Amino acid sequence: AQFQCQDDVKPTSYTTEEQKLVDQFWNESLIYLDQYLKALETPTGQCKDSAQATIQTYNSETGKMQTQCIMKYRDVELVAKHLKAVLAEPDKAKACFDPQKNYKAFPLYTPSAHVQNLSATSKWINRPLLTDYYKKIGGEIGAAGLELNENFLEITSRTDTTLHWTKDVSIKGLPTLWSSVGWIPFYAENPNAGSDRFRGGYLYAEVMGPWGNLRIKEIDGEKVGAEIGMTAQLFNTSYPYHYHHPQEIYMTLTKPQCIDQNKHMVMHWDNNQFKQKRSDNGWTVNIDGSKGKWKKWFSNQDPEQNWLTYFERNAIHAFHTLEGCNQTIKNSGLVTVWARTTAQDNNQTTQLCRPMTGAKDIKTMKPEDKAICDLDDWKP
Ligand SMILES: [Zn+2]
């Protein structure tokens, strides 16, 4: 196959020592991607040829969860095809691999010195630390960011990969990868992103994709849509209802301490539990989960049964960690393998719904609060 790297991949010369640090990072990236491919393709549940994924946590007609075999989606098949090409010719794919030591697009971080010390690679890359970032921010956002990042290893280690992976893809098994990838406090400065604790208590990182360490633009002329990485969300937070053009996949790593520790919702934009009005080349979607109505929309997540979920384009989704033992645990959260399948077409923006009652209620946003989502049409 012929690999074309993204435009911001600049071939670099490393010393013999540096190359060994790059090589360990690359080797663990390949393990992560091979395991990702196996997680897509290995049959589970009642699916014969690929993994069984949740696609709606509440189907309005059945009143039940709705699933699909994940490789039935052509965009997922294409991710699998591109991962196979990477894994078949890793030396060629490596031309597009960059440790992002001097990455200019935006800041990338390491959670803490403790996490940085997990690998010589992470130490050499020497990203700014999130503990420093949140100490400077201060306030309630900084307090949440300190709680997550000072306890990052404990939070991200409370995982069980033994049922749906054949190697430990967590920070325990791939420490160079998890310590060296660029972590992003995506919501710390976003005033629309819900509570201060959620904003400080949220991170993601990208291993492969247009902003990852592996940045392949095309393989054999096909645009690579795959964007693969990980997310971490602090316990006792609610990620507000949100939506976006790219289809998305979540694989839950966290082993929960109670069945309802980590709840998620995914419902298609036209689900009859919501109210939709056509806008201008889009839809206004009103969500009223008040007075307990939200509860049936949310399902529990765990690394055994409800481990895999696929979000169709513009599907409304949310991740909720306020219930149950979130009121008794500590140093916990929701940690996932995260991916999008079409990262190079349409609008990549992660869009947030907003409170029906206005901006004054953003900081308490949670599933029971009425919300408005302004969806845009995508190009088929
Ligand atoms: Zn999403």
Q: Are 246 and 379 in contact (CB under 8 A)?
A: no
CB hemisphere CA count around 10 (13 angstroms): 6
Q: Which two tokens stand for residue 330?
A: 């500590």
Token code pair at residue 40 = 């897509």
For residue 333, list its beta bridge partners: 234
β strands within the chain, DSSP E: 3-5, 52-56, 66-69, 183-184, 202-208, 216-219, 222-223, 227-234, 238-243, 248-252, 263-267, 275-278, 282-287, 299-300, 308-311, 316-320, 333-340, 351-352, 354-355, 371-376
| Phi-psi sector, 164: left (phi>0), alpha (psi -120 to 50), beta | alpha
Q: How many angstroms does the Cα of residue 245 sit away from the middle of ligand 1?
A: 9
Question: How is residue 232 annotated by DSSP?
Answer: E
Nearest to 144 by CA among 53, 237, 80: 237
Distance 319 CA to ligand 1 centre (A): 10
Residue 243 Cα, ligand 1 centroid: separation in angstroms? 6
Determination technique for this PDB entry?
X-ray
Q: Count CB neighbours of 368 within 10 A.
A: 17
Q: Which residues are annotated as a binding site for Zn(2+)?
A: 244, 248, 317
Residue 105 φ then ψ, to 5°: -60, -40
> What is the domain extent for residue 254?
1-380
User: Can you give the C-alpha Rg of the chain in angstroms?
Assistant: 20
Structure tokens at 63: 């009143």
How far apart, in whole angstroms, are the C-alpha atoms of residue 105 and residue 339? 20
178-192 burial, b for 16+ CB within 10 Å, e for fewer? Answer: bbbbbbbbebbeeee
Of 214, 251, 245, 252, nearest in space to 342 by CA: 245
Cα(28)–Cα(178) distance, integer angstroms: 9
1 Cα–ligand 1 center, Å: 31
DSSP characters over 125-183: H-PPBHHHHHHHH-HHHHHHHHHHHHTHHHHHH-B--TTT-SS--STTT-HHHHHHS-E
In angstroms, the Cα distances linking 160 to 118, 174, 307, 321 are 20, 14, 11, 18
Residue 104, C-beta contacts closer than 8 angstroms, at least 6 positions apart: 8
Rounded-to-integer distance, Cα 130 and Cα 146, Å: 8
Collapsed DSSP state (helix, strand, coil) of residue 14: coil
**CA–CA–CA angle 155, 246, 301 (5° rounding):** 35
| Alpha carbon of 317 to ligand 1 centroid (Å) | 7
| Resolution of the PDB structure in angstroms | 1.5
Binding-site residues, in ranges, read 244, 248, 317
Q: Are 324 and 234 in contact (CB under 8 A)?
A: no
341 by DSSP, 3-state: which? coil
What's the gap in Å between 11 CA and the centre of ligand 1? 32
Q: How far is the centre of ligand 1, averaged over its atoms, from the C-alpha of 337 (Å)?
A: 13
Domain count, the chain: 1
User: Ligand 1 mean position to 117 CA, how many Å?
Assistant: 31
Find, among 252, 258, 207, 231, the residue nearest to 152 by Cα. 231
Element (H, E) at 22: helix 16-41
C-alpha 334 – ligand 1 centre gap (Å) = 14
Contact 353, 241 (CB under 8 A): yes
Nearby residues for ligand 1 (ion, Cβ within 5 Å): 248
User: 322 C-alpha to center of ligand 1: Å?
Assistant: 19
Cα(270) to ligand 1 centroid in Å equals 17
CA 374 to ligand 1 center in whole angstroms: 15
220 C-alpha to ligand 1 centroid (Å): 28
